[PDB]
Design a protein around this ligand. Structure first.
Ligand SMILES: COc1ccc(CCc2c3nc[nH]c3cc3c(=O)[nH]c(N)nc23)cc1
Ligand SMILES: COc1ccc(CCc2c3nc[nH]c3cc3c(=O)[nH]c(N)nc23)cc1
Ligand SMILES: [Zn+2]
Ligand SMILES: [Zn+2]
Lengths: 355, 355
């Protein structure tokens, strides 16, 4: 049987890595994109899907999901599932913060977050953190990061207390520190002292823009343990993914939101399929994409469906977008393994931004 | 190669018939349900799908559909397609009527309706008729039916003038006459004198209710040629279909509308999946249904998706509903062929209405 958790790096190019995470429910090829499980009928394709902790804890509630057999049974997905810890979502969508946790309209603490994720049955559990708002002053970023590190220890202890969770799931710690190198270093040191199965870069994709995000990744990723997976939370567009892989990121969580609003991803950049220019375009959404939508239907027909208000149009767009992202990740993995990722990144950008 | 059109009756029970329509693009098993082609990725499953003449003539226009290669190429469907003549839809959704045709906000005549259906490339073409409003006085029903019969002759002549259409498609005439036996007879006589490949019962499913609809079918269907298919337009719920088959109907055009509004069809009657009673129900939508949704997911999960606003929920509901209707038609065909349709209809009603 597969181990609870084992990350192996098969090949490297610069800071980029490709490899595998083995878990009891399956193997995850990295760099990996992790789609939302409810977006479409995701097929095994993705190696791991996201569960929506924040939504599930409100409807139907984590206790009810456990009564129904856990998220794997509920969603019909027998492979790994990753869940976020819920605080990012509470702070973005719902609040009163304290050292105990976050109260909102009802108290979410590290201990409760870990128990919710246990009741959902997820395989990769995120520590309960605070995503510091951007911009943040050095003092506020430090105080926030320090609280997150105390919460990371409480998350570790709560996870270790639940035998089924400790023996079958994995726990990731989340680095904070805003855009400040010294705080990112203190956060990395604190997380490594606690010890986690993987390490996330939190506190980005919060409005800072790509140049600043890449600058922060430049110094932040090397601070994390090299032999553990690196998960960049909340990122992102295809070009953000490529640049983050170039900086040592292994896992990523737009393709669903875009698919419901008329935006399709292609190797020549995004297109808004509702635009009249596509009304007579017989080409598939993307000229090279191998997905079932591009094998069968034209831009003109998908344009027609979406303009007519047919839900089928949005579903076909979403299926194409998820498949496009998975083809992107496969090309990334293959190019790193083959030692041609630098060339791939250059070729990708030249075509994606030529439009 | 298959003929342009050939209807064969394989078995009968009372007024019910089962058989096949052969056309160049495929065989249609009857009694048949014909789903909307844009509702989901319909697989061959249905033998024939509906094209939406009224929508297509406005967006992108019939000329544009022809430029794109016709509806078969546009929709990715190589089997038969049926199109309505457009007047029902103009009168229900858009008007100024005259002997020439209907002007609306732009002139739809028998000749233009036939040419639109030619440009769309459909295989079964409906004559351009007037669906008389309900209720109608005898005088108004007569005047309306008489105009429809003049329009039926003009439709016949326009269809016969287009070589590609006359040689490769089929034309159905539409009986009118409201609820009046003498007018239904005059309409049937006029249509049979013109001569059509199939005959539709029009002017029903316009608010009259099931008892009255069945009463009209009781005398109206026997007036049509026995050796030609009988298409009841606009019907209907599963129980309407069963009772109409008992009265000699072979083809039918709710499952898509219901699927987008939370209603699922089951052998125990319809259910509204959004209701809280389904939040913990681990059974599939229907206990016997063989569709892909019922093989994989529970009522509880589909309830969750729809309540969360996920388009996936509505798509799974729609796929189940279309599959349910096709299983209904298969059971109807098998039971007629086996001489147990009367028993099937009795068993169906007892369970469907017990709920
Ligand atoms: C549906 O499943 C999931 C959905 C979203 C996410 C990412 C959410 C997210 C951020 N998003 C942008 N920046 C973020 C930053 C963070 C962050 O700093 N911490 C946490 N815990 N989450 C963040 C993870 C899983
Ligand atoms: C999308 O493709 C299609 C959609 C709807 C229909 C049926 C429309 C319809 C009626 N509906 C209820 N009563 C009707 C009655 C009629 C009728 O009397 N005549 C015509 N031409 N149509 C009718 C046919 C094809
Ligand atoms: Zn595609
Ligand atoms: Zn089903």
């Amino acid at each position: 049987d597969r181990p609870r958790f084992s990350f192996s790096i098969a090949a490297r190019e610069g800071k980029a890595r490709t490899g595998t995470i083995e878990m009891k429910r399956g193997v995850i090829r990295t760099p990996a994109f992790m789609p939302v499980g409810t977006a479409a009928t995701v097929k095994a394709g993705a190696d791991i899907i996201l569960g929506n902790t924040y939504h599930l804890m409100l409807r139907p509630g984590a206790e009810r999901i456990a009564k129904l057999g856990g998220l794997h049974s509920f969603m019909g997905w027998d492979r790994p599932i990753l869940t976020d810890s819920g605080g990012y979502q509470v702070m973005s969508l719902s609040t009163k913060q304290s050292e105990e946790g976050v109260t909102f309209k009802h108290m979410l603490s590290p201990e409760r977050s870990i128990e919710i994720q246990h009741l959902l049955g997820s395989d990769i559990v995120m520590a309960f953190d605070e995503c510091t708002p951007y911009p943040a002053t050095p003092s506020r970023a430090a105080s926030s990061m320090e609280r997150s590190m105390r919460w990371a220890k409480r998350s570790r202890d709560a996870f270790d207390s639940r035998k089924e969770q400790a023996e079958n799931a994995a726990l990731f710690g989340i680095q904070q520190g805003s855009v400040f190198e010294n705080l990112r270093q203190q956060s990395a040191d604190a997380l490594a002292e606690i010890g986690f199965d993987g390490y996330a870069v939190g506190g980005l994709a919060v409005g800072e823009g790509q140049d600043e995000m890449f600058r922060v990744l430049d110094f932040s990723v090397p601070m994390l343990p090299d032999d553990k997976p690196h998960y960049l939370m909340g990122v992102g567009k295809p070009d953000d993914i490529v640049g983050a892989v170039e900086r040592g990121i292994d896992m990523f969580d737009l393709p669903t939101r875009s698919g419901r609003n008329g935006q399709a991803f292609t190797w020549d950049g995004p297109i808004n399929i509702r635009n009249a220019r596509f009304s007579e375009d017989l080409k598939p959404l993307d000229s090279e994409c191998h997905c079932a939508v591009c094998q069968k239907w034209s831009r003109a027909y998908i344009h027609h469906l979406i303009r007519a208000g047919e839900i089928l149009g949005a579903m076909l767009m979403t299926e194409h977008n998820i498949a496009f992202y998975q083809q992107l990740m496969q090309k990334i993995r293959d190019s790193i393994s083959e030692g041609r990722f630098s060339q791939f990144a250059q070729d990708f950008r030249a075509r994606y931004f030529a439009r």
